[PDB]
Symmetry: C3
């Protein structure tokens, strides 16, 4: 495998583990990230995924050798390979779980895309972010809509057309990540606090809320509200909602937060 899975309680830790290449995205880790996501998709015991790069780097891009190797197969193999990386962005973005990305060192090209589809991104102040693609003659093609949705067209355009590079303090200022920490100790503390907040929140409740936020663009407003109101009733009447509102009234923690 190219990942290292450490399932603890309802938190699944996923480390990108090719430190030689700064955990660059080989073709297979795309396959292997997509299958883990697919494996936990319906699993409400899996409450949160934590995404980290091994050895001080999140992800420096798509793997050099594999992409070199790909020419032998031709441009139609680049399409469906590219699109399959697109599908990882869709499936990671739509993951019912809370996706925390812990980002240090290099966060470039497709590593940057991956950061764009997290619910929570925690950055090391000296991490370096960027979209090299066009200086290399090529396209941040699958990332494009996800960076727009991340930081807004105004910052995405500049970053993509000038290949500008920047640190975690700047990725924070640009609304690309939620937190920026000085060193490792403070990353983890930030990470553990984030996981304690998450523990307060119900997993079916989180999944449906998420789907609503994601859908809230598409998307005529009135119809979205009609449907949201149905989903709200369903949640109130289900096992999670009755426990959670009962817990509130009885001034206790709900089951999932014990």
């Amino acid at each position: 495998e190219t990942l290292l899975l450490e399932p603890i309680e309802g938190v699944l830790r996923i480390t990108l583990n090719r430190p030689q290449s700064r955990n660059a995205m080989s073709l297979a880790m795309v396959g292997e990230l997509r299958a883990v996501l697919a494996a936990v998709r319906d699993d409400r015991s899996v409450r949160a995924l934590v995404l980290r790069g091994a050895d001080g780097h999140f992800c420096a891009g798509g793997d050099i050798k594999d992409m070199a190797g790909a020419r032998a197969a031709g441009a139609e193999a680049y399409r469906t390979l590219n699109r399959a990386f697109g599908s990882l962005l869709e499936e990671a973005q739509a993951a019912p779980q809370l996706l925390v990305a812990l980002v240090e060192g290099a966060v470039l090209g497709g590593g940057f895309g991956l950061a764009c589809v997290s619910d929570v991104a925690i950055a090391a102040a000296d991490a370096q972010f960027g979209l090299p693609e066009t200086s290399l003659g090529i396209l941040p093609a699958q990332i494009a809509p996800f960076v727009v949705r991340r930081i807004g067209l105004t910052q995405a355009r500049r970053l993509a057309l000038t290949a500008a590079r920047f640190d975690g303090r700047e990725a924070l200022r640009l609304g690309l990540v939620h937190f920026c920490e000085a060193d490792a100790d403070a990353l983890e503390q930030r990470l553990e606090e984030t996981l304690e907040q998450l523990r307060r929140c119900a997993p079916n409740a989180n999944a449906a809320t998420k789907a609503l936020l994601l859908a809230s663009e598409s998307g005529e407003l009135g119809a979205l509200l009609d449907d949201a109101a149905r989903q709200f009733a369903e949640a109130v009447g289900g096992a999670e909602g009755s426990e959670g509102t009962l817990a509130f009234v009885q001034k206790r923690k709900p089951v999932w937060a014990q």
Copy 2:
């Protein structure tokens, strides 16, 4: 009512007034707010709305007594009453008036909802914002589209899926509110400043302008511009754009600014 109405000239102040429950939205209060908004919707003598909470809290969420009462009527009651709270947000968001929110203390759940549909929000630094909904097994269902519109998916996903509390200074940073003041004299000065800026501005112009902006979120650009051009022509030549452009070439205030 559950409200106190204060109409000073062109400014209708509206105070949520159930201080006992930190001004929780009751079924009655949503009804009254909707009735008031429809009352003035077509009235251009009413140029601004100020939305405020009695006793140092803005609004703490849905009223628990009413949520408790609805279980007796089942899923259909939860749906119909949640959707009507969605109708309040729609009709406040789309009000022809400038809607100013002065938010103090608790700004939670449906409370955080109303803040998200103001043209101008001014918060107390010690205000506490949050979406507790999924920490209770339910959904900020009607809120979802208005919060993603408010601050973007990237911030909304974190607030919603972690039930994070945070203060006024943070709410300014995240783009949730437009000003954060440290005390009540400051909060009030900002309010009256905003209101004097607003009185420069004509009411039919503001109204037309606010609809276009709201339509910009989802409207195909070409056809939106088409319509916008017709509206511009109808503004310049109406009995407001002519007074306005006149006051300008003359060296005086247009009448609405008197």
Copy 3:
């Protein structure tokens, strides 16, 4: 002619030159800026455009001699000329070139609009921005969708409906421009730093990326990704890209960067 044009290698400078009306957008200027854009649209040797205003002023808005005289002509004249200014905004927004704006002095109404469609805006701390339209009884009708996209509904609704004015530093905090500097020597220096980052990026790659970016904001995700992935294979297969990947794997700069 209302414009000075100075090409140099890949960059084309365009200076708004009616310094006497604060370079106010006359009917003639609009037609001229449109023709330019159109001549260079398909020309990939023009890699960037730079917009600037003459005599320390960017653009104070719509020329008032031209706007007052248009009243002889009636509603349709205003409609047609307004829609024309929108088309300008459309055509600039969609320029396959990297569009840079340097912004000084007045940036009001119309001028505010051209800034909202640049890829990189660089502002003078002393620049004053604003949307005075409703204070004049009229609408920033064609601006409305571009500023919503620029800075988001939450900020655009307060600027437009209070005719609030703000400086270069504020315009940066609001995300309206990317860079702010205290003096022209610095505005200047930022421009060339910006242009150097760009020369690293290949012009066909940048045109295709910008198109993707522009089509994300509301263009269905799945279809978009399908097509982007086709495009990705072609960039990787073409002249740019094959050269870029090489120069990267090799020690050197690609040709467009030399």
